[PDB]
Amino acid sequence: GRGSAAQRQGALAIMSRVYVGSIYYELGEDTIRQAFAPFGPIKSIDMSWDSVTMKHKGFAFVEYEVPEAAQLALEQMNSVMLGGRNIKVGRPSNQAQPIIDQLAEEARAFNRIYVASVHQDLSDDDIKSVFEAFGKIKSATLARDPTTGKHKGYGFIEYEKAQSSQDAVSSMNLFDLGGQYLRVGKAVTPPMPLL
Amino acid sequence: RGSAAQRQGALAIMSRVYVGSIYYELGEDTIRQAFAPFGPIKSIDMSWDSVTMKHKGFAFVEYEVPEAAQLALEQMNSVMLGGRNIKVGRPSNIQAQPIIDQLAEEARAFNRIYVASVHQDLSDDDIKSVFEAFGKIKSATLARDPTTGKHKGYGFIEYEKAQSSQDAVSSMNLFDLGGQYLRVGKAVTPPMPLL
Ligand SMILES: [Cl-]
Numbered sequence: 019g020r021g022s023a024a025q026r027q028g029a030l031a032i033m034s035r036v037y038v039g040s041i042y043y044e045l046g047e048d049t050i051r052q053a054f055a056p057f058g059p060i061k062s063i064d065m066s067w068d069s070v071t072m073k074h075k076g077f078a079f080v081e082y083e084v085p086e087a088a089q090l091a092l093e094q095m096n097s098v099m100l101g102g103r104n105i106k107v108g109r110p111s112n113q114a115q116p117i118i119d120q121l122a123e124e125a126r127a128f129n130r131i132y133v134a135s136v137h138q139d140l141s142d143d144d145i146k147s148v149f150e151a152f153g154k155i156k157s158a159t160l161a162r163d164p165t166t167g168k169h170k171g172y173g174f175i176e177y178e179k180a181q182s183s184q185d186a187v188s189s190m191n192l193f194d195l196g197g198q199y200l201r202v203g204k205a206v207t208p209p210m211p212l213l
Numbered sequence: 214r215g216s217a218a219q220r221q222g223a224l225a226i227m228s229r230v231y232v233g234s235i236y237y238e239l240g241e242d243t244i245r246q247a248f249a250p251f252g253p254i255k256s257i258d259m260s261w262d263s264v265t266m267k268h269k270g271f272a273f274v275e276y277e278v279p280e281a282a283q284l285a286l287e288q289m290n291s292v293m294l295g296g297r298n299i300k301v302g303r304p305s306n307i308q309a310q311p312i313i314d315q316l317a318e319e320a321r322a323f324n325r326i327y328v329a330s331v332h333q334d335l336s337d338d339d340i341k342s343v344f345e346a347f348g349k350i351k352s353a354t355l356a357r358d359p360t361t362g363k364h365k366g367y368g369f370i371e372y373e374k375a376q377s378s379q380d381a382v383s384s385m386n387l388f389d390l391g392g393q394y395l396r397v398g399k400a401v402t403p404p405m406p407l408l
Contacts, residue, residue: 108291
C-alpha cells in the first residue's frame, strides 16, 4: 500500500484548504465566506493580520470539510472580482504531495462525483432521481449533521459507469436547482480514504 | 452592442492573461513554454525593475485568440513553476466589460469549440474525423500561417448540435493525440466577431 492512515489524514487536511490572495483591504471574513460557501460549507478561515496597521495582509486560507470543495473553489473562484480586485486562488504552498498524488490516483477507481450547493429541501432520493438521468447509480448520499440529521448542502454520488459520471459533471455543474446553482465535480479522493 | 472598433478592443483584452508570482530566476522563455499549449503566444509583456535588474514577478501573456487565454486561465492557475504556485487572471484594466459580455452572449448561439495543441501532422480532415465521433460537424478548420499555409496548432470546430459540442469538450480536453495533449474548450466569441 502507501501512506499511513496518519499520512493520508495530513494530506486530506491540506487538500481541503485553498489560498485566497489579493483580497481588497475593506473586505473581511464574512465576504470571503459568502463568496466561497457555494462549493461547500466553510469549516474555518485563517485570515492574515497586521498588528501595527490593524488590517489583514490581503490573503487568507479557506478550509472546507472535504477536498472536493477546495478543488471546485480552485477551479471556479480564481480571478473572480471581489471588492474591485481580481482575487487569486491557489493550493497551499507548504512532503504531502506524493500522498496527495496517491489519493488522486485511488479516486480514479471510483465513478464518484461531488455535488455542492444542494438546496435544503432536496432529499437523497430527490438528488438520486435527478442524477440517474445520466446513468445507473450505486449510491447517492448527502452529508448530514451528526446531531440534527439535516443535510449540509453537499453530497457524493457514485455511478456504475465512468461515462455516466463524466456526463453528469458536464451537464450538472452550475445547474439551477431549487433556486441555487449546483457546483459539481469529479471526486479527488476515494471514499473512506483512511480505511 | 458596440461598434467594430469597440469589439476589437475587447477582443484584444480578452486575448491576454495576467501571470503573477513568477519566480525571480524564471524568464520569458519559461513562461512561453508553460503557456504555449493553449495556443501560440503572440507576445509577452514582462515586468521590469532595472535598478535591481530583475522582473517584478508578473507578466502578461498575449494569445492570438480569446479562447486560448480562457483555457490558460482555467488550466494554468496555481500550477507550480520554479517552486512557486503561479497566479493567472484576467487583466484588471478593461469599460470593455460590457462588450466582452456581449461577445460571450453571442458566442452561445454557435456550437463552436476551440482546439489547441494540435500536432503538426494532423490535417483538417483528420481533426474532423476524430471529433465527428461526438456528432455531425458543420465545419472543422485549423488556423494557418498566411504565408506558408502550415497550420498553427489550433483551430475551431462547429457542431450542428449543442450536446455534440458539450460531449466533445468533456471527452477531448487533455486527450493524448500525436504525442501531445489537446487543450479543448467552448468558444467565448462568435465566429467573425467584427462582421
Ligand atoms: Cl495519436
